[PDB]
Structure 1
Amino acid sequence: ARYLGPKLKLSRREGTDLFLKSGVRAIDTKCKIEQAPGQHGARKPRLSDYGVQLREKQKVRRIYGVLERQFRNYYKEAARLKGNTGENLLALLEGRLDNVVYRMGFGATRAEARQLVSHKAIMVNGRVVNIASYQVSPNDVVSIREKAKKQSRVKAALELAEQREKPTWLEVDAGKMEGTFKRKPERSDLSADINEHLIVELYSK
């Protein structure tokens, strides 16, 4: 129910950094990011339209660490929700407690954030939530447990978060180690690299 394999292979297949490492060091130093994984990775085969659509969907999944069944359910929800399906889908992935914890800087990676959430180190609105998929509403307060505040990982993650660009829709206070989900991120707030239209088209295939 989670991918436990090598992380950099995923980024190499996608051809872009998926932030599956802390970012303490450059991905290029850690691996040959440009080259696809395996023996025939150096060869670059032509990609079909289906191939392009598949790769975009896999990229988004690999970024947020969501398996196909859950990702399909997100798509279905996004299509049901009023407005732009592709934008709705990205908003749902952003609303995940796992992602929010990473974006608040409590976790160095989304996987690290996942372990924190899973290991009951995270509270939402003062109640402990250990579900990675939990959806955070606007004006919700996400905070580390007092017991877990002392953890070294969390402090290191906060420092890394300072290096990264700060999310506008999240207000986070260090030391207090609490954050507020002010609003659902706009499409503009998220990276323009992702092409959500390919995913929507793929699910209409």
Structure 2
Amino acid sequence: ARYLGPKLKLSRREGTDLFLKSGVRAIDTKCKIEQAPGQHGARKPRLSDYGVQLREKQKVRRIYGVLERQFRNYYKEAARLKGNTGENLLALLEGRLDNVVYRMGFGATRAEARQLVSHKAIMVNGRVVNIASYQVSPNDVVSIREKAKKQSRVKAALELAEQREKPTWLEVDAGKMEGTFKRKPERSDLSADINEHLIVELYSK
């Protein structure tokens, strides 16, 4: 129940790079960004009105790996909760287990950390969790269990996202097995390109 076969050609559809393959030279076109969505590759994408809403719903679904049954539950939960419908929807995305394990250093990509969630490795607050939507509450430690502390790839991950921005709303020990979901990630410390207007106005009918 996720998108398997190719990965970067989907970024060639959605314009800018989605962090599916990162850290190496594939930032600058190891797949020719904007040149080949498909057979009819570098073409004329004469856009529409419904499209610029429909691209955004499959932008942030595909940045995290969430299908359509699950992403609507995050939407319908983002109405009953107090505040902005859009901003709570990004808050409910950032509190996701896989999204935290990625940008708390662990793993090369989110799909790897998802597999590192699903292979019994991660441990939240002293508790084993192998479900990729355990939605983390603030002041909780992340932790890798003992029998998979150093296997191959853990130590080479932190260095790549350390050239990336150190986010405000989390604390992290680069030494070992210690994190803190600090407080609510605001709109300012988002990736700032995602337009929350174009999802709230999509599902509303």
**TM-score tier (shorter):** over 0.9
Structure 1 residue 76: deviation in Å?
A: 0.6
**3-state SS of 1:123 partner:** strand
Counterpart CA distance in 1 for 2:75 and 2:25 is 34
Return the alpha-carbon distance in structure 1 between the equivalents of residues 78 and 36 of structure 2. 31
Deviation, structure 1 residue 175: 2.1
Shift of 1:22: 2.9
SS at match of 1:83: coil
Aligned pair count reads 205
Task: Say what the alpha-carbon RMSD is for the aligned residues.
Answer: 1.2
Tell me if structure 2 keeps the 8 A contact 1:95–1:135.
yes
1:51-102 deviations in Å (ceiling 9; x for gaps): 1100011011000110011001101111121111111111111111101000
- Partner in structure 2 of residue 202 of structure 1: 202
**Local SS of the residue matching 1:156:** coil
Contact 1:15 1:36 (8 Å CA) reproduced:
no
Question: How much does 1:28 deviate?
Answer: 2.6
2-side partners of 1:41 and 1:133: how far apart? 36
Q: How far did residue 10 of structure 1 move? A: 1.2
What do residues 132-167 of structure 1 show as CA deviations (whole Å, max 9, x unaligned)? 111000001111111111122111111112121111
Distance 2:177 2:163 in 1: 17
**Which has the larger displacement, 44-53 or 90-99?**
44-53
> Structure 2 CA distance, aligned partners of 1:44 and 1:160?
36
Q: Is the contact made by 1:102 and 1:110 (CA closer than 8 Å) also made in structure 2? A: yes
When structure 1 is superposed on structure 2, of 28-37 and 42-51 the one drifting more is 28-37
Distance in 2 of aligned mates of 1:36 and 1:90: 30
- Any conservation in 2 of the 1:142–1:180 contact (CA below 8 Å)? yes
Worse overlay, 193-202 or 172-181: 172-181
Q: CA deviation at 1:184?
A: 2.1
- Alignment correspondent of 1:101: 101
| Structure 1 residue matching 2:153: 3-state secondary structure | helix
Offset of residue 36 of structure 1: 4.2
Structure 1 residue 130 displacement after superposition? 0.7
**CA distance, structure 2, for counterparts of residue 135 and residue 44 of structure 1:** 41
Contact 1:27 1:33 in 2 (8 A): no
Hey, what's the Cα distance between the residues in 2 that align with 1:148 and 1:56? 37
Distance 1:90 1:18 in 2: 17
Distance in 2, matches of 1:75 and 1:123, equals 27
Offset at residue 16 of structure 1 (A): 0.8
Match of 1:83 in 2: 83
Which whole-Å deviations, capped at 9, do the CAs of 1:89-140 have from their partners, x for residues lacking one? Answer: 1111111110100010101111011011111111111111111111000001
Distance across 2 between alignment mates of 1:15 and 1:36? 11
| TM-score computed with the length of structure 1 as normaliser | 0.96
Deviation at 1:27, TM superposition (A): 2.7
Is the 1:24–1:160 contact (alpha carbons within 8 Å) kept by the matching residues of 2? no
| The 10-residue stretch of structure 1 (63-72 or 177-186) with the greater mean CA deviation from structure 2 | 177-186
Distance 2:184 2:6 in 1: 31
2:179, 2:195 → 1: CA distance?
Answer: 29
Q: How far has the Cα of 1:185 moved from its partner? A: 0.7
Closer, same or farther: CA 123–47 of 1 in aligned 2, 3 Å: same
SS of equivalent residue, structure 2 residue 41: coil
Q: Runs of 5+ in structure 2 lacking a partner?
A: none
Aligned match of 1:131: 131
TM-score normalised to structure 2 length? 0.96
